[PDB]
């Protein structure tokens, strides 16, 4: 979806955890945004 963007939005940083309209318009984070992910160590073991 990001590779389909054109114009000046092609240069936009994604900013997944900026979701308040204040955060999208002012360009800075104002709320602590939590996520949960599965990330792999160098031994191949996945961690939450």
């Amino acid at each position: 979806r990001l590779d389909k963007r054109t114009g000046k939005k092609r240069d936009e940083q994604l900013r997944y955890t900026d979701v308040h309209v204040i955060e999208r318009d002012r360009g800075l984070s104002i709320k602590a945004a939590p996520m949960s992910l599965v990330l792999s160590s160098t031994k191949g073991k996945s961690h939450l």
Partner: protein, 96 residues
């Protein structure tokens, strides 16, 4: 300063219809250095009682610390004269 001027978006407020009832007392608010118009534009929901259909501008960007090379013989990587030096005592691990 340097910006365009348009028609008033909402020309439906006059200072005289709202009498000095209870809240607009000038003998109540404390006066300091005056608020210029750029302050109202920069933070529109704090300095305006009716900020209708205003757009939030991008707050700030991280500063570009780039300086063009006026000497077309220097290497691409060098310590520029405008860059402040770093000392060994500018590192100085105090408690090790």
């Amino acid at each position: 300063p340097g910006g365009p001027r348009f028609e008033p978006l909402y020309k439906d407020i006059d200072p005289n219809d709202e009498d000095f009832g209870e809240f607009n007392a000038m003998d109540r608010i404390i006066f300091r250095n005056p608020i210029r118009t750029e302050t109202r534009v920069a933070y529109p929901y704090l300095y305006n009682s009716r900020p209708r259909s205003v757009h939030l501008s991008w707050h700030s960007y991280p500063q570009i610390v780039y300086t063009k090379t006026e000497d077309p013989e220097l290497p691409a990587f060098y310590f520029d004269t405008s860059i402040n030096p770093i000392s060994s005592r500018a590192v100085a691990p105090k408690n090790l």
